[PDB]
Design a protein around this ligand. Structure first.
Ligand SMILES: CCCCCCCCCCCCCCCCCC(=O)OC[C@H](COP(=O)([O-])OCC(O)COP(=O)([O-])OC[C@@H](COC(=O)CCCCCCCCCCCCCCCCC)OC(=O)CCCCCCCCCCCCCCCCC)OC(=O)CCCCCCCCCCCCCCCCC
Ligand SMILES: CCCCCCCCCCCCCCCC(=O)OC[C@H]1O[C@H](O[C@@H]2[C@H](O)[C@@H](O)[C@H](O)[C@@H](O[C@H]3O[C@H](CO)[C@@H](O)[C@H](O)[C@@H]3O)[C@@H]2OP(=O)(O)OC[C@@H](COC(=O)CCCCCCCC[C@H](C)CCCCCCCC)OC(=O)CCCCCCCCCCCCCCC)[C@@H](O)[C@@H](O)[C@@H]1O
Ligand SMILES: CC(C)=CCC/C(C)=C/CC/C(C)=C/CC/C(C)=C/CC/C(C)=C/CC/C(C)=C/CC/C(C)=C/CC/C(C)=C/CC/C(C)=C/CC1=C(C)C(=O)c2ccccc2C1=O
Ligand SMILES: CC(C)=CCC/C(C)=C/CC/C(C)=C/CC/C(C)=C/CC/C(C)=C\CC/C(C)=C/CC/C(C)=C/CC/C(C)=C/CC/C(C)=C/CC1=C(C)C(=O)c2ccccc2C1=O
Ligand code: HEC
Ligand code: HEC
Ligand SMILES: CCCCCCCCCCCCCCCC(=O)O
Ligand SMILES: CCCCCCCCCCCCCCCC(=O)O
Lengths: 51, 25, 223, 149
């Protein structure tokens, strides 16, 4: 029950499911998806990230 | 050893195009 | 004020020209141009005593100031007149702002400090080593205006934080966190410097273990 | 070992947004464009401002500024563009400055983040700079509130 395949494709991307280590929040989820560089405002909730 | 996929280039590069962005999440 | 401008130039001429130039343009391999650095840069660099610098090494240290408050204002006014730049916040009476720079949200300030500042200054502004002879200093002696202008001007190798990257209210929250984490007492005994495992392990070996071995020697026998 | 000929403090550059440049015997300090922006570009036909300080390295003679050209538009110099014996010439009034001016009439668009080439010509010396745009002491522009997603 402890053993897990690390390379099982589980992460949705623009070219199908991929293993976790190949991806991040910067991996596009569809072609042309707009991902902004957002900065931390330091206030928890109430827009913690802004453009 | 040095990582084979890491080399300096001399090509200058171009200014990136303005992002437009496709629809459909 | 023309008097303040001529006093600043007069002070500048026998203290800063050898490294910065007669026209504030810099002397190559000796000191940078000061054009556009602003009054805030002068305030930070001279009120913490870093300027005038005494030699070239890895990092210029802070030390006792060579000028008083009015002379610092005069020097900052003279530099401001050559290129402008950021200025030091003031209060109603025209004094350099200190208490009004303490922001009201210290939890936001702590979160911002841990994201932006603790990498170089440590969890509680105790200082940290940088690359080769450089170091982010202990923050416990800076007054609020010094903290504010340090963020505003980006000294030596400290990143520059513009008023657009960190708005004035964010900066005031950060200075509140920096000041309060310097003035809060330790809760669990003597704070041991605030660095954590290294001084704690030093205290175990030189106090706890020395005591335990001395007691063992007292109870036990020799030979 | 940190106090030798290659020293870390002494080669440090000013922590400002403008650029330094050597035009023969003239030092060009804090050269930058003022150009408040609203969208991805500042469009052609806008008038932006080119600011700098010119410092006379020589202390014997005088010097004068001619013919600033660029491939972003045309530059008009207004005022007495002469830089004195061992003095400065402040061109434009920068952000926190409480009348030589360089007005750039744009022909192609510009955007904050990129560098743009300008050619300064003095009566002794002439060089190209690659000038940035600096928002100065202007506040951060509001960002429209994001919804819930
Ligand atoms: C921040 C850095 C430092 C932090 C330290 C904090 C920790 C404190 C550690 C406490 C040590 C535990 C000892 C408890 C014993 C107390 C009972 C007692 O009276 O013992 C008498 C005991 C004699 O009984 P014995 O076991 O029959 O001795 C055998 C021979 O007579 C003796 O034959 P000998 O000639 O082979 O041995 C003589 C030996 C005496 O020293 C010892 O043998 C003990 C040294 C312990 C070192 C621990 C090992 C670490 C080494 C690495 O000579 C010395 O080295 C003299 C040292 C100077 C005396 C200590 C003064 C310290 C003042 C601090 C200010 O001698 C001592 O231990 C006297 C020294 C301690 C003075 C009392 C201090 C108490 C309060 C401490 C904190 C305040
Ligand atoms: C079995 C027994 C076991 C138990 C042992 C218990 C012993 C410990 C004492 C008990 C605790 C008391 C009860 C409650 C705690 C308390 O009431 O506490 C008050 C405050 O106290 C500290 O506040 C200092 C000021 O009061 C503040 O004003 C100031 O702000 C603060 O500044 C910090 O914070 C700033 C952020 O703002 C930064 O800017 C700044 O830089 C710094 O970090 C200060 O802290 P700091 O300088 O750490 O300590 C300085 C200490 C001084 O050192 C100490 O006594 C520490 C001693 C323990 C350390 C042991 C190290 C061992 C080293 C190794 C042996 C290495 C050598 C081996 C290699 C050799 C090589 C050769 C081969 O003060 C002094 O008394 C100085 C004068 C004289 C000191 C003497 C006091 C007692 C011992 C004396 C010894 C005999 C002779 C006298 C000595 C001069 C901070 O903790 C605060 O949180 C805390 O609030
Ligand atoms: C004695 C011995 C280790 C023999 C084993 C030989 C052997 C089989 C070797 C093969 C294994 C290998 C390759 C070992 C290499 C070493 C290694 C990597 C060790 C792994 C872990 C390990 C086994 C460590 C044990 C080390 C050890 C025996 C330590 C105790 C030393 C002694 C005798 C201390 C008593 C003297 C004493 C109380 C002095 C006063 C207080 C002082 C100054 C203590 C020194 C001191 C210490 C020891 C700290 O750890 C420390 C940590 C953080 C801050 C400060 C200190 C500090 O000051
Ligand atoms: C691998 C590595 C790290 C290499 C570097 C090693 C190195 C060069 C260290 C020495 C640093 C020094 C001492 C610099 C100055 C130059 C100098 C004087 C060198 C020695 C010259 C010499 C051999 C002749 C004189 C005679 C002699 C032997 C001198 C005594 C040297 C002494 C006693 C110095 C201490 C050495 C040392 C590295 C100790 C570490 C102590 C530690 C780990 C403590 C942690 C600790 C800290 C850091 C706190 O901030 C703190 C705050 C509040 C309470 C407690 C603490 C606390 O314990
Ligand atoms: C040579 C030994 C110097 C003397 C004398 C003075 N300054 Fe200096 N200064 C020098 C260097 C090498 C540097 C750069 C790295 C550093 O230590 O910060 C500086 C820096 C400044 C700054 C900061 C510039 C920035 O980019 O914002 C300022 C405002 C400054 N120096 C001012 C100043 C004044 C007012 C001096 C006379 C009291 C003075 N400096 C002396 C080198 C040297
Ligand atoms: C590492 C790259 C740093 C980061 C990130 C921050 N700081 Fe810093 N700071 C750093 C250095 C190397 C120095 C010394 C520069 C000098 O010219 O000597 C500083 C200085 C300060 C100071 C002045 C401290 C004084 O001596 O009293 C303050 C108040 C300060 N730094 C605060 C500060 C804050 C609030 C930061 C987060 C925005 C921050 N620093 C980031 C290195 C680095
Ligand atoms: C035991 C020490 C052995 C030394 C290995 C050196 C490896 C260098 C290779 C890189 O590239
Ligand atoms: C024993 C020392 C002799 C060599 C002198 C080196 C001086 C450089 C020190 C700094 O850096």
């Amino acid at each position: 029950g402890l053993i897990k395949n690390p390379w099982k494709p589980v992460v949705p991307t623009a070219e199908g499911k991929k293993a976790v280590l190949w991806t991040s929040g910067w991996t596009p989820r569809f072609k042309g998806e707009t991902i902004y560089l957002a900065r931390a405002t330091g206030r928890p909730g109430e827009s913690p990230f802004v453009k | 050893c040095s990582p084979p996929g890491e080399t300096a280039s001399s090509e200058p590069g171009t200014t990136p195009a303005i992002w437009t962005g496709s629809p459909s999440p | 004020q023309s008097a303040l401008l001529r006093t600043g130039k007069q002070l500048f001429e026998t203290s800063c020209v050898s490294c910065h130039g007669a026209n504030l343009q810099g002397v190559p391999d000796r000191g940078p141009s000061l054009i556009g650095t602003g009054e805030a840069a002068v305030y930070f660099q001279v009120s913490t005593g870093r300027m005038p610098a005494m030699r070239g090494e890895a990092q210029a240290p802070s030390k006792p100031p060579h000028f008083d408050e009015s002379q610092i204002d005069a020097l900052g006014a003279y530099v401001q007149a050559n290129g402008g730049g950021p200025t030091v916040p003031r209060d109603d009476h025209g004094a350099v702002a200190q208490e009004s720079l303490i922001g009201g949200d210290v939890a936001r300030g702590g979160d911002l400090f841990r994201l932006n500042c603790a990498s170089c200054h440590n969890f509680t502004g105790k200082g940290g080593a940088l690359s080769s002879g450089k170091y982010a200093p202990d923050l416990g002696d800076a007054n609020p205006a010094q903290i504010y202008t340090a963020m505003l001007t980006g000294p030596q190798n400290m990143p520059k934080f513009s008023d657009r990257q960190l708005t004035p209210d964010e900066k005031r929250d950060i200075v509140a966190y920096v000041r309060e984490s310097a003035e809060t007492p330790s809760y669990g005994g003597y704070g041991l410097g605030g660095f954590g495992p290294a001084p704690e392990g030093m205290a175990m070996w030189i106090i706890g273990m020395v005591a335990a071995i001395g007691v063992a020697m007292w109870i036990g026998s020799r030979a | 070992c940190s106090a030798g000929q290659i020293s870390q403090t002494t080669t440090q550059e000013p922590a400002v947004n403008g650029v330094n440049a050597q035009a023969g015997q003239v030092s060009l300090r804090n050269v930058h464009l003022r150009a408040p922006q609203q969208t991805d570009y500042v469009e052609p036909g806008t008038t932006v401002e080119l600011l700098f300080v010119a410092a006379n390295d020589s202390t014997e003679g005088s010097n004068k500024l001619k013919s600033i050209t660029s491939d972003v538009g045309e530059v008009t110099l207004t005022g007495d563009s002469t830089v004195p014996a061992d003095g400065v010439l402040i061109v434009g009034e920068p952000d926190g400055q409480i009348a030589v001016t360089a007005e750039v009439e744009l022909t192609k668009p510009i955007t904050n983040g990129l560098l743009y080439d300008f050619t300064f010509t003095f009566e002794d010396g002439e060089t190209t700079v690659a000038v940035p745009i600096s928002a100065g002491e202007q506040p951060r522009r509001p960002v429209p509130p994001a919804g819930p997603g």
